Amino acid sequence: MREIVHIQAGQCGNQIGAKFWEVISDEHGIDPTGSYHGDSDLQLERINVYYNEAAGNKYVPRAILVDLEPGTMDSVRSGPFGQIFRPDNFVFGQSGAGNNWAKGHYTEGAELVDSVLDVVRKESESCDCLQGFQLTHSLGGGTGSGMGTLLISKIREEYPDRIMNTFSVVPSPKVSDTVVEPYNATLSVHQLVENTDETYCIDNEALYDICFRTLKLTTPTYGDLNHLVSATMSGVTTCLRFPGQLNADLRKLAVNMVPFPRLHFFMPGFAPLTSRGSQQYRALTVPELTQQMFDAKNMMAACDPRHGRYLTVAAVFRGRMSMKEVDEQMLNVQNKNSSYFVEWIPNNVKTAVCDIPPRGLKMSATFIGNSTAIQELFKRISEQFTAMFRRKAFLHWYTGEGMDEMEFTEAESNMNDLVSEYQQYQ
Amino acid sequence: MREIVHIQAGQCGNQIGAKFWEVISDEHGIDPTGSYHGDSDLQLERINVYYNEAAGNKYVPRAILVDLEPGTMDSVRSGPFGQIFRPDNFVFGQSGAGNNWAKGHYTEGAELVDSVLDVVRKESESCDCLQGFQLTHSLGGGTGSGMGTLLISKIREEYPDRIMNTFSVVPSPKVSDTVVEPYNATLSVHQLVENTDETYCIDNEALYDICFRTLKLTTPTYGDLNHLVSATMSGVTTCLRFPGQLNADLRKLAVNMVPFPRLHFFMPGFAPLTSRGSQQYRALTVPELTQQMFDAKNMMAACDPRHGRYLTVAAVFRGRMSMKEVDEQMLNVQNKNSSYFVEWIPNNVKTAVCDIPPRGLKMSATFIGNSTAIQELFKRISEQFTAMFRRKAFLHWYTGEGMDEMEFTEAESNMNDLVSEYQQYQ
Amino acid sequence: MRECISIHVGQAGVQIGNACWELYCLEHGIQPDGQMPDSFNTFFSETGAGKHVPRAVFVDLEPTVIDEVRTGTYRQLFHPEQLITGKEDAANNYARGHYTIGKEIIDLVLDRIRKLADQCTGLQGFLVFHSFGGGTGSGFTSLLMERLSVDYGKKSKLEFSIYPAPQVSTAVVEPYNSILTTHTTLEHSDCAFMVDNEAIYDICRRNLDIERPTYTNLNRLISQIVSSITASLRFDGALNVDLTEFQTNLVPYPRIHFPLATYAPVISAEKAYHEQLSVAEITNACFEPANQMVKCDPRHGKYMACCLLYRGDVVPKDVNAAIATIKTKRSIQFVDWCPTGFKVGINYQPPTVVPGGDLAKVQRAVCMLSNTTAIAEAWARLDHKFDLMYAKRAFVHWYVGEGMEEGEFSEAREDMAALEKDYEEVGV
Amino acid sequence: MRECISIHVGQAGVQIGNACWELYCLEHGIQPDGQMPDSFNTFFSETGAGKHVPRAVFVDLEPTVIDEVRTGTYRQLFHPEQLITGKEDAANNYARGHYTIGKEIIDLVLDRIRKLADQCTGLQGFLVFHSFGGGTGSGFTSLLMERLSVDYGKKSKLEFSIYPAPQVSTAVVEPYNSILTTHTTLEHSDCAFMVDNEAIYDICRRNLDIERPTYTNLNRLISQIVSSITASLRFDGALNVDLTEFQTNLVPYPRIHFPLATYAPVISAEKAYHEQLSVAEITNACFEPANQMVKCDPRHGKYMACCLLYRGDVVPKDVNAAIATIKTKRSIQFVDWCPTGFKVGINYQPPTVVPGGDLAKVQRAVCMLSNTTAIAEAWARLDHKFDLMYAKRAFVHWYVGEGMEEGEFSEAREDMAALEKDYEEVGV
Ligand SMILES: Nc1nc2c(ncn2[C@@H]2O[C@H](COP(=O)(O)OP(=O)(O)OP(=O)(O)O)[C@@H](O)[C@H]2O)c(=O)[nH]1
Ligand SMILES: Nc1nc2c(ncn2[C@@H]2O[C@H](COP(=O)(O)OP(=O)(O)OP(=O)(O)O)[C@@H](O)[C@H]2O)c(=O)[nH]1
Ligand SMILES: Nc1nc2c(ncn2[C@@H]2O[C@H](COP(=O)(O)OP(=O)(O)O)[C@@H](O)[C@H]2O)c(=O)[nH]1
Ligand SMILES: Nc1nc2c(ncn2[C@@H]2O[C@H](COP(=O)(O)OP(=O)(O)O)[C@@H](O)[C@H]2O)c(=O)[nH]1
Ligand SMILES: [Mg+2]
Ligand SMILES: [Mg+2]
To answer: Which residues make up the binding site for Mg(2+) (chains A, B)?
Structure first.
């Protein structure tokens, strides 16, 4: 009945996206050829939310893959599950953006964007009732950031009444993977504040920490990091795909968690997470899950939630569970940590439960926190950007692509405004 | 219903602690994997006092293992019963304290203490109703003494209404195992007088004597010594873990035995103790047990109880016994040895009986004496400390770690005060 | 899909190309005959059936050096028309290269380049290998650079340059040439990767235990760096960086386009066995001045942009940790206008090693491209050298003979003074 | 987890290191090639697969002694870069070691040390082996010590020193060197374990029935003591003592940091069979002056701190009893300001013995580290020796030639006078 359209932009976007797709396939019992080999009828009842049925009992992701370089696409197509994707849904350029937002948004991306829009339009028109769109990408590169942002805006123009969701991997505090990161991030943020309904802030640093400290992983891989993200994504849409006792879809969550339009940057979290050794020495109960959820070490954003206050928290539980227990525990946590919750929104917590747990587990939870501590991240980027602009460093790479200084200033202003707003509520 | 949280600090603390845990496991029928293979339902009814149930019918000690060196931890983990412990409950540093109280308390220990506190907090919050805490450690080293003491204080701040128990191995009169022993001991004592509810004074010398003279052990091992301590500990908590005719838990014992807050240093004892040969040539009756209990040769502190007076004595009996016999015998002993009991506390003896005897035996007893003779121990340390301070010997090792002379003086003053107090009551 | 054209100019360029192409062949399993019994396609075109041809042009103004290529082991590897030779050399004279001799062969080479480009579907750009000091490497290269910009423009151009050493040097007129080529090429090049023969010698001696390094060894070492740079295009990796990236991430102002290359670990089979070559350890090696490939003092300068290209058995987290550690270290200083100074590439393929080479087989390597105010010092000495000789008009007549004017020298001087000023000012 | 770096300086240091490392290899089953078919990790790093490398640096200012290591049986055991040699020796001249010759190689050695430390997760500290009398063992060592303190500081530093004998001695300038190194190293060292070649000779002759002991034998004997000291770190024991402990338990005042080593039992297979080597008996052996490893009279001094490290089949109670007995004995006197004079370590591993060694295989051993006012006597004789020679300015010119000033000698004298005064005053 309801449908979700998936978009993947740039390297990071594609790589996370593939993992996500794999996860989804596993969940719904669909193999790398597109055929259903599941068992439970619940797996197939709402399969249309993510998959189109392409006849001969075969299923194909409602997924669009976009990049200015073909290498990533090639890598994906050759991967395990590369064959499930519709060949015509891979939309690639030849040039690349060279970690330049300008190229992604105004130049190379501009040339290619029309085609992707057309594909998206086609996808929408086949689906009976689109809930909306989920975009996976980074803010730090050129494609995912510049072209992805452009795509969002164009989508919104066509479909202003549909939900616009992003899973954005953002620049970490400790180490930078690009030199121009602050510029790319900032510009992306500028567009995102105005054009998306919610943004899940994923940080690679946080993921690494989780892998090291919680998962006890000596040598984490980018794949492993992506897996966590994928899991979170899956958790977020579970109520659309399976039955439950209390159900919350993308719109319900959004309305619960965004009290003012601009404040839609979430810190996602996932629970439980245990090592191979420490699997034995703990019981799989709701309390443990709750503990894991409300903990700085388990947050996928590089921000300490205890340095701000939670405006809203959405908790999504999977498995056969006592609702009473959940209700009590959510209450109890709030009572305990009253100082970390904004005082003018009584009952800061929204709860949803899906009866179907993920595979291999008895019970799972996904956490979405809207914390005023996210301001810290924004501040750090903002400062950096200001510093860079003070010396006009790297600016000719962007102005050379037709961009004007004024745009940069505007972006800065928006960024500062957002942080001010966050502070006010804090 | 009631819960005990166990803490082990430094080498001595860890090594005694492991033995204790083993003993407890044996008693409750839990094997080195965490699984219950017992028979009697009484063994499992109050298993929650010491063990958390970690699902898959497996049990894990509510135990925290702390050291500034990892070697001890490694040794423990590799030992028999090393596998039952929760891996995340081992909290170790990298540096060590080098038998320096200052390092344990202010420097290395300070860095690590927060983590241990957090772990403790977590443990407490899972348990429904904590009775309190038991800490095993020495006073003569740096970790157990300096860091252990620090831990106590921090615990007390959080949980001022819970019972704080220590099993402290103290410096012997004849031979010293460290050169700076008097300093470390003294400082530890200073903190202990103000922050613990009771302290069981264990002396290695006394244990050795017991092994040689009573147990007829040609070559006692440190393990064997530890065993006795473990047994005593087990005896002390028996009423929390099993049923009985007259039951006394940690609070009941404390209130019976501590008439003034500072006077909470006990001389523990255990009975019976026989050789392999002398097992045949005596009957297992209450009188024999009583005799063994009230005897200088059977005290685990290097002090002659006949050189002072008993303020209070708590006797804890295990096995199927006639209460009348016990009552008579306790009376009789008091009548006989009137001169060794303070005259202004009529009925100096508190009695408790637990129906479940320890394994392999029909009947057992544990003795806790609050004797004014303990002053002797304090005096000996005090004199030594004063002598050392007269020449400022080794002082730069402590002042170099940020400590001031004033603290030392304060400690000395407290020590002297305590002995004066003891004398007054005598 | 996306392709890269290599240009090898003059003796130095040609010899480096020989190494590089050999390495490429080894890496992709292409025999010296062009046969192999699909990413290599970025560097090799395919003709008919079971033959592969380098996307390369070799140019020299004299026949001798290229004649060795056309008679040597890899004679069948290259198409005859892509090996271009004149008759008379540029005789260490920029003017001969840029005007008198170069203007006779430039059109031909351009046509070849155009033809190469016609076979490309997604041309990434050009890699040009040349010396600064030789008449062809300087004069011809500048001519060619300028021409390229007109014909193509927007496509990225990358230079690999044998920068002259402070003490050691072969030519007498080398400073003149270096200044002049710098002046003329500045506005036409996007990024130029300098290396120094002295530094490579020292590294060979110190790190590889080679008593007597030959030019071949140096060339081989250079080849490794080139492979590292292009591995992101020739293989698939975890996190990867194309040729279009570098110019954006390493050039903060248009004229300050001289990043320097460093490779690690460079060690023999003797010292390889007795070492755990971890990611942190290799990374650390790169930021110590003795291992770097240009003789110069980074300790006396500040870093502006740093790009680290890892290869082989490498995992992101450890790299990140290493970077953090480097950042923490007070003796490695970055300019205050650049809080994010790192660009990181990670590729799965370990460095392949040439049979009979000096280097041991390693699980991991790193190639750092670093941009530093320390280059100013290097520029300064060169300037000083120029100044002395011009004070006496020493050798100036030769240049004039070949059509150059004295005013050009003045202009070149002025431009270099400007450059050094710019370098200084960025620092503060 | 917790690691220990060994530094071997000059001939004496290097030779001792050779013994020690061999012993370690024997004990952990590491072959001379670094292979073994996990506590040993405190002393050996692990590289790649099936190779182990000592956490050691060997330094000498001439090549000859280390050249034997690099050509000998254990050539594959050590990494080439951790065996550091200059070209010209310090020629029994402190100044050459500390200034003229030493300043050329010190930086290099420091870099190596830093690199070693980078591979450590829980660095306990350094063990430095050197003579007091040689130009490198003195001058270089002092230089290195000072440098270490600046770079690291808080980490513990331990010295093993061949103290010059009263009668027997090799060098003529030995007193000068000894005084000077003592002066300069005093504030930089935490604890220094002296031994004496004369004493070891006598013990070898008397206790082991060896007519003609060679330096090798002495080295072997030393190695045992070192093993005893470090066994608490390299194995798991009943009651154990790390490197950070000693400095706290043996040094009552900062300058009085010279405890002495004694080992027991040291006996041949002849006298081993006809003896019940009990814990009490071995312990007693240690407190009789003929068995001690420095020639000196403890009967004429007082004990201030005593540390006993037991190894093998040993049980706490008997040790305690032995200690009590020792305390009771009126002829073994402790200073009145120290009622608790014993620090006790007990380790489960019996001493391992080198095939073809002089020592018999025993169930138990003990290494005593004892700090005694009797060291004052030793200091005094040395001082007297210094005084005589300086009275005539004998050899002084040589030192001056290498940049030393006469005033430095005076300062050194003064400092030694102070030290002896301090020693005297502690006694009373
Ligand atoms: N690294 C390296 N440097 C070289 C090689 N051959 C020459 N050089 C350096 O290049 C410079 C000399 O320039 P060449 O390339 O020989 O001269 P050319 O480009 O042929 O110019 P002309 O002969 O004057 O037309 C000097 O700095 C040489 O040290 C080589 O094979 N490897
Ligand atoms: N125990 C022992 N002592 C040694 C050994 N070799 C030398 N010595 C002693 O060390 C002192 C001489 O110092 P060396 O170590 O030879 O001199 P060096 O440190 O090399 O200093 P220079 O040669 O002057 O640079 C004398 O007291 C020797 O008896 C050895 O192998 N074992
Ligand atoms: N979580 C995750 N992050 C990635 C992955 N690949 C790249 N990134 C991040 O994405 C950023 C680089 O942007 P990228 O998407 O490669 O550039 P673009 O292709 O121009 O958009 C850096 O912050 C990387 O850490 C991946 O597989 N997983
Ligand atoms: N009963 C007992 N005492 C011990 C044991 N190990 C060490 N000790 C005592 O503890 C003291 C040394 O302190 P230790 O705990 O090793 O130092 P720390 O690690 O710095 O606290 C001495 O008095 C020893 O006799 C043991 O296993 N059992
Ligand atoms: Mg030439
Ligand atoms: Mg020598």
So the answer is: 69
Give me the amino acid identity at D93. N
Q: Which CATH number fits domain B374-426: 1.10.287.600, 3.40.30.10, 3.40.50.1000, 2.40.30.10?
A: 1.10.287.600
Return the CATH fold of A260-373.
Answer: 60s Ribosomal Protein L30; Chain: A; (3.30.1330)
Interchain proximity C273–D80, CB inside 8 Å: no
* Tokens encoding A245: 């006792």
Q: Which residues contact C126 (CB under 8 A, 6 or more apart)?
A: C4, C5, C6, C7, C148, C155, C156, C157, C158
Cα A233 to Cα B44: distance, rounded to the nearest angstrom: 43
Tell me the three state secondary structure of residue D304.
strand
Report how far Cα C69 is from the mean position of its chain's Cα atoms: 21
Beta carbons of B210 and B231 less than 8 angstroms apart:
no
A–C: how many Cβ contacts below 8 A?
113
Domain boundaries, chain C: 1-259, 260-374, 375-428
Instruction: Considering chain A, tell me which residue range(s) the CATH 1.10.287.600 domain(s) occupy.
Output: 374-426
Query: Which residue blocks in C235-345 are alpha helix, DSSP H?
Result: 243-250, 269-273, 279-286, 316-328
Fold of C375-428: Helix Hairpins (1.10.287)
Q: Measuring CA to CA, how many Å separate D191 from each of A344, B69, D188, D260?
A: 64, 22, 9, 10
> Is residue A138 a known part of a binding site?
yes
User: Structure resolution in Å?
Assistant: 3.3
Atom of ligand 1 nearest to the CA of C195: 1
The answer to whether the CB atoms of B53 and A283 lie below 8 A apart is yes
Choosing from D46, D146, D198, D245, the catalytic residue is D245
First to last CA, chain C: 44
Ramachandran area for residue D272 (φ above 0: left; ψ -120 to 50: alpha; else beta): alpha
* Experimentally determined by: cryo-EM
Beta partners for residue C160, in sequence order: C129, C193
Burial string for B342-379 (b: 16+ CB within 10 Å, else e) reads beeeeebbbbbbbbbbbeeeebbbbbbbbbbbbbbbbb
φ, ψ for residue D292 (rounded to 5)?
A: -75, 155
Domain boundaries for CATH 3.40.50.1440 within chain A: 1-259
Biggest alpha carbon–alpha carbon distance for chain C:
62
Question: Which residues belong to CATH 3.30.1330.20 in chain A?
Answer: 260-373
- Taking each helix axis from N to C end, the angle separating C64-71 and C10-28, rounded to the nearest 10 degrees, works out to 20
DSSP secondary structure letters along C230-261 = HHHHHS--SB---HHHHHHHH-SSTT----EE
How many angstroms from the chain centroid is the CA of residue B56? 33
Contacts of residue D273, defined as CB under 8 A and 6 or more positions apart, other chains included, come to none
Extract the tokens encoding D54: 């000592």
Contact A71/B at CB under 8 A: no
Q: Are D375 and D70 in contact (CB under 8 A)?
A: no
CA distance C352 to C362: 9
Residue type, B35: S
- For C260-374, which CATH superfamily applies? Tubulin/FtsZ, C-terminal domain (3.30.1330.20)
Among C210, C85, C187, C183, residue whose Cα is nearest residue C136: C85
Q: Closest approach of chain A CAs to the CA of B11, in angstroms?
A: 25
Q: Which residues in chain C have their CB less than 8 angstroms from residue D78's CB? A: 274
Classified as helix, coil or strand, C76 is coil
- Alpha-helical segments (H) within B196-340: 204-209, 222-241, 250-257, 286-293, 323-336
Beta bridge partners of D128: D7, D159
- What CATH number does the domain located at A1-259 have? 3.40.50.1440
d(CA D428, CA D424): 7
Fold of C1-259: Rossmann fold (3.40.50)
Q: What is the C-alpha to C-alpha distance for residues A198 and B2, in angstroms, rounded to an integer?
A: 47
